[model samples]
Target: DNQKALEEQMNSINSVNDKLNKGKGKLSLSMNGNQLKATSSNAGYGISYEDKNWGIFVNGEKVYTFNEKSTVGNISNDINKLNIKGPYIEIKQI
Candidate 1:
């Protein structure tokens, strides 16, 4: 079981942009400084290591970022208001 979970996690793949985007997930900090900040681009969204939900997306598109204070649920309710649903992972908040 643990092995399957590990495989599922490790089996996850991210493009260069997703992997390099880096913000608001397992790899982000969530502070005003060097915290994780998810960002989007023409290529795709950033990658996250703290989410197991259906997936991250924006404007009806599959995104590659974590819902950071700087990215999603921070600016407005649009991100949070999206018709998205799933058991999401946890984010480090302090």
Candidate 2:
């Protein structure tokens, strides 16, 4: 019984880990109310949030704005399509 309980707990933890690590080495965002939070697994990449306008910035510059209907998933999808290595990153609304 104790062994079975341990296995169950292990599985539960693994499931949660899988969700957190779903997009490894990629940009991730989680929206909370009016705020949009972001992170990236890649060391050379990062995210920034702008107030009032709900702008999504990459590497400290405004790159995108979030519409009321936008979700984190959609934003990430757009970011993935960007070749954002130059000094300027373009802003696009989805």
Candidate 3:
């Protein structure tokens, strides 16, 4: 069910992107790995990326980036809940 929801959202974003491209409008996408990997422009906001990469895109470029660390607050909400398992922390003896 969770995967399905994510898939649906991804598809929706893709469809919206198709329309925006046809009109040559601005877009954004989420990226991972190296921040410099993304491209930027002088006329526009430029390509943006996330640190850990939540993988969210806008139009055709990356304007919003996200990561597990991106979330704030000791409490949780829709995206991050106490029982969500992840979006949390753990300690290990190394």
Candidate 4:
């Protein structure tokens, strides 16, 4: 009877785990003066959204800015070079 009761208790205490493998990605945009303000979000675990051609800034200083007349490949390469260090994950435009 004791063993049977223990088995039932263990069965009732089943392990459960959940994971967020998908995301609801979105973009928010507004106008600020002559510049176009933009924001975005990806509400999921381990999800990311890429905004190419955006400017990279740190501490109110421009680290890197994408050129409007440049090719995507070149801009990507330049941004990659600039991101060779840590804590360079914030981007903005001015």
Candidate 5:
């Protein structure tokens, strides 16, 4: 349901992007020789992503990294957890 809501949120924002080397603020996506791809952006806080070498950036910087390990989303108590199986992350002005 979180993904569904996220999909709608992206649609509403009409801001869902893919594999672009820019600011990642909202919910984005990705892929390598394996996974798919997605992207997002915002004003101050947002999401960022990279392909060739996949990882979760706190912003424009490589703040976090992971291997085959997948990250889940529970951004808040209201917004359910996120699970695109191959998705970026998001936050409500967090």
Candidate 6:
């Protein structure tokens, strides 16, 4: 369907840094204290997750929800162009 030109998401093929160097997206993470945050790269972007409910949220929206069935389930809003790889979330698209 991917009809949301203003919003979409994808998976990581190589390194997330590769996408960052592309200058098309931004990533924000801090595992130093076992914590992570999504401040944004170009616009107002962010990621929120709830393991208890098993879901992911983009911006201040609802949970796109997480599917443990596989490693390809992802969700978002304007981040329609973002990527989710474990602790890496490139809030952008191609």
Candidate with best TM-score: 4
For candidate 5, report its TM-score.
0.19
Return the clash pairs for model 4, or none: none
Give model 5's clash tally: 13
Model 2 misplaced stretches (Cα beyond 4 Å): 1-52, 86-94
| lDDT tens per residue, model 4, 1-94 | 2323232222111210011112333222222333323233342111233443545553345656754333434444444544333222234333
RMSD of each: 12.4, 16.0, 15.2, 20.0, 13.1, 14.5
lDDT of each: 0.32, 0.39, 0.27, 0.34, 0.32, 0.32
lDDT of 6 by residue, 1-90 (tens): 332342233343134435433332334332222233333353432222222233443343442443222222122222233432223333
TM-score of each: 0.20, 0.30, 0.25, 0.32, 0.19, 0.26
Candidate 2 per-residue lDDT, tens place, 12-91, comes to 32343344344433344443333333344544222232322335443346767754233444555565455343222222
Q: Give candidate 4's error at residue 10 in angstroms.
A: 39
Between the candidate structures 1 and 2, which one is better when assessed by lDDT?
Answer: 2
Q: Which pairs in model 1 have colliding backbones?
A: 23-37, 24-36, 24-37, 28-36, 29-36, 30-35, 30-36, 46-64
Local accuracy of candidate 3 as per-residue lDDT tens digits, 1-94: 2433242334443453443233221232222322212211222321222343444332333333334233311111222221222211111101
Better of 1 and 4 by lDDT: 4
Model 3 misplacement above 4 A: 1-4, 31-42, 45-94
- Candidate 1's C-alpha runs over 4 A off are 1-76, 92-94
| lDDT of model 6, residue 94 | 21
Worst 10 residues of 4 by lDDT: 12-21
Best by lDDT: 2
Residue 79 of model 3, lDDT score: 20
